[PDB]
Amino acid sequence: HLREQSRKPSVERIKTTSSIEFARLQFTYNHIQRHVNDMLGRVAIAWCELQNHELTLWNEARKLNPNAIASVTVGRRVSARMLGDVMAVSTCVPVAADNVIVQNSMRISSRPGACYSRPLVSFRYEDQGPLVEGQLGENNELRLTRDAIEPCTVGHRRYFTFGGGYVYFEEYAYSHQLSRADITTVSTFIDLNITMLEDHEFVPLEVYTRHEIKDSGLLDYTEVQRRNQLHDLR
């Protein structure tokens, strides 16, 4: 009550405009603006909370697989391991895809009964450099120590990521390479479809033009005068 009472503090004739459309526009704009601003604010907040929430996931993830987690979080293929509570990385060395060779057999003839668990490869760094023996790791990584073995088992049948696709071994024998398209795919993603609001043009529109309004009067005084003042000269 006090607050409303604090508003009280020659002659003039107030002039009112003929078009109320400006205040109507202002109302529509203010309404929409308020709503869209509110919702988008809410989105910004919820997203912000979500990121901190998933941090907790990423710490355990990087304990599980520091190479991939660091490779994502740094921006390039690196290697990483934990130095207590902090991570240590180092940039890997790329190798051209035409300079990598999958070996046929996954069983070492020297000691029977022991077959290499992952397919071994042989590659080169420069297109003229020496050859290097290695073994295929996860996600196109070239491992140098062939300590990945396994007791040979009947029923062996494996796919391994190779290049931009896969390689297929049956009974520790090189079957064949196989590109991504020939394996049914499931997705961990959640879709969302956003199409921009298209452009729209507003053409000028009038219910009545001022010429129709001037013609609304049954007798335009001016035209009557001009006609009737020509009688002597006519």
Ligand X SMILES: *[C@@H]1O[C@H](CO)[C@@H](O[C@@H]2O[C@H](CO)[C@@H](O)[C@H](O)[C@H]2NC(C)=O)[C@H](O)[C@H]1NC(C)=O
Binding residues for ligand X (CB under 6 A) = 193, 195
Residue 201 interacts with a copy of itself (CB under 8 A): yes or no? yes
The option from a copy of itself, ligand X, another protein, none interacting with 14 (CB < 5 to 8 A, set by class) reads none
- Which region, judged by CB under 8 A, interacts with another protein, from 2-10, 75-83, 198-206, 223-231? 198-206
Q: Under rule CB under 8 A, how many of the chain's residues touch another protein?
A: 53
Are residues 174 and 104 in contact, defined by beta-carbon separation less than 8 angstroms?
yes
Are residues 149 and 127 in contact, defined by beta-carbon separation less than 8 angstroms?
no
At residue 203, what are phi and psi to the nearest 5 degrees? -85, 150
Residue 90 interacts with a copy of itself (CB under 8 A): yes or no? no
The option from ligand X, a copy of itself, another protein, none interacting with 11 (CB < 5 to 8 A, set by class) reads none
At residue 91, what are phi and psi to the nearest 5 degrees? -75, 130
From candidates 210, 217, 228, 233, binder to another protein by CB under 8 A: 210
Q: Which two tokens stand for residue 174?
A: 């090189």
Q: Which two tokens stand for residue 216?
A: 């609304």
Q: Which of residues 13-32 bind another protein (CB under 8 A)?
A: 19, 21-22, 25, 28-29, 32
Q: Which two tokens stand for residue 129?
A: 């450099």
The option from another protein, a copy of itself, ligand X, none interacting with 41 (CB < 5 to 8 A, set by class) reads a copy of itself
Distance in angstroms (rounded) separating the CA atoms of residues 136 and 68: 16
Over the Cα atoms of the chain, what is R_g?
40
- Which region, judged by CB under 8 A, interacts with a copy of itself, from 12-20, 93-101, 137-145, 148-156? 12-20
3-state secondary structure of 199: coil
Are residues 178 and 166 in contact, defined by beta-carbon separation less than 8 angstroms?
yes
Judged by beta carbon, residue 72 or residue 95, the one nearer another protein is 72
DSSP label at residue 233:
T
Question: Looking at the chain, how many residues does it have?
Answer: 234
Which positions touch another protein (CB under 8 A)?
A: 19, 21-22, 25, 28-29, 32-33, 36, 40, 43, 47, 54, 57-58, 61, 64-65, 68-69, 72, 118, 138-139, 157-161, 166, 186-194, 196-197, 199-210
